């Protein structure tokens, strides 16, 4: 099969600036006639979409801003200017030989003005305590960039087991990310402590944002 | 102008399942229906095609004897049967009506197949109460995925954050935030709706102050 080598793996661009991704075929993707090279894009949690077929032909719907180029072993996809709604994973796909083959992906981040997470902490609810579990939920919304570190303190001691984190994909519309962190204990260990603290360390403030409650 | 694929599937290690992909606004003998596997935090694998005009099929060597493509050009539907399932078959499966003419192209919204020998467990829905203000609900310990959270039955959607389910204890846990102006609440009820088709459960939950 043909190894398709997408470069780079990751790409962060400001709105309005240009963008270019590369694709290398380990063989020429020109049959006898035209060259069956395609580009797709998967906007976050959406089926993939085909942008470009046959190296250069724009697929109905794609804006004039996109264009792809190449021949034989080398191909690139161009954007310029870049916009919010281009956030996605780009794939080069070849059809010159069965089995047809796919690049590894190129992940497109919109780079924007840094923004700090809006944070809130939520004590376990009564309804849950009655059942034996206790979960402290901390929401960390609308921040940029993605890399963010979250830390839980129970009565002043760092705590590491029980914490599950989950990130949304980059928001096509406002270009921020968002995060849940969730400290799950047992009702008795929850009752044994007093102070619960969720601390966001991000590139924004120096020291963390820290939401908290007592009891 | 839509391909619709069938709903999410949970099925046992060993069984078979059948995925459907139904067109509207074109006929599927004008295209090749392709199938494409997306393992979560990995690449698209191509599985092959069916030409619903001669019922020709071609599978990729990795999927032969694992995969059966069929098509019903009478109800304009394309089929992908997967056989003797394994953990490696846990993925999302898209059908693509696609053809280079001598073009134009459609994608289905995809079908999530989950290979587990575990059991349907409905969620527990927990309320999350504290310019503007943030509210949420916690959806804990259900199985399989998905669940869906809307807010006030869809009317609220602006400033809703809803996170990918995470696996732990062999069930999923997720949650949703919604941020409203603190005049709107609690002066006006904020409710979160939770659908778990797999257990046929629906939960409305009001966010009252503590």
């Amino acid at each position: 099969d043909i190894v398709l080598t997408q470069s780079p793996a990751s790409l962060a661009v400001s709105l309005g600036q240009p963008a270019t991704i590369s694709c290398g075929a380990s063989k020429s993707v020109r049959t006898s006639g035209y060259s069956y090279m395609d580009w797709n894009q998967q906007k976050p949690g959406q089926p993939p979409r085909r942008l470009i077929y046959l190296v250069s032909n724009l697929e109905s719907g794609v804006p004039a801003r996109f264009s792809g180029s190449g021949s034989g072993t080398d191909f690139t996809l161009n954007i310029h200017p870049v916009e919010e709604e281009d956030a996605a994973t780009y794939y080069c796909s070849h059809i010159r030989e069965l089995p047809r083959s796919s690049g590894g992906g190129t992940k497109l981040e919109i780079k924007r003005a840094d923004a700090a997470p809006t944070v809130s902490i939520f004590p376990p609810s009564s309804e849950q305590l009655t059942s034996g579990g206790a979960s402290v939920v901390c929401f960390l919304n609308n921040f940029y960039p993605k890399d963010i570190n979250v830390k839980w303190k129970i009565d002043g001691s760092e705590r590491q087991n029980g914490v599950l984190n989950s990130w949304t994909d980059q928001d096509s519309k406002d270009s921020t990310y968002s995060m849940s962190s969730t400290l799950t204990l047992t009702k008795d260990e929850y009752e044994r402590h007093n102070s619960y603290t969720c601390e966001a360390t991000h590139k924004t403030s120096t020291s963390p944002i820290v939401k908290s409650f007592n009891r | 102008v839509q391909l619709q694929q069938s709903g999410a599937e949970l099925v046992r290690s060993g069984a078979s399942v059948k995925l459907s992909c139904t067109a509207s606004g074109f006929n599927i003998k004008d295209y090749y229906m392709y199938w494409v596997k997306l393992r979560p935090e990995q690449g698209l694998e191509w599985i092959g095609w069916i030409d619903p005009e001669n019922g020709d099929t071609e599978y990729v060597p990795t999927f032969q004897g694992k995969v059966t493509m069929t098509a019903d050009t009478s109800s304009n539907t394309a089929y992908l049967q997967l056989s003797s399932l394994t953990s490696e078959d846990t993925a999302v499966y898209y059908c693509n009506a696609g053809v280079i003419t001598m073009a134009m192209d459609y994608w289905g919204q995809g079908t999530t197949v989950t290979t587990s020998s575990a059991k349907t467990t409905p969620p527990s829905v927990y309320p999350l109460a504290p310019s503007m203000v943030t509210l949420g609900c916690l959806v804990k310990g259900y199985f399989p995925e998905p669940v869906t959270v809307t807010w006030n039955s869809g009317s609220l959607s602006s400033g809703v954050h809803t996170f990918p389910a995470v696996l732990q204890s062999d069930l999923y846990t997720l949650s949703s935030s919604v941020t409203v102006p603190s005049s709107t609440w609690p002066s006006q009820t904020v409710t979160c709706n939770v659908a778990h088709p797999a257990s046929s459960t629906k939960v409305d939950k009001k966010i009252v102050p503590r």
């Binding site: 049959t31 006639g33 | 004008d30 090749y32 053809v99």
Partner: peptide
């Protein structure tokens, strides 16, 4: 001419 198999149609 002749449409590449699996890929192109008249």
């Amino acid at each position: 001419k002749h449409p590449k198999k699996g890929v192109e149609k008249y």
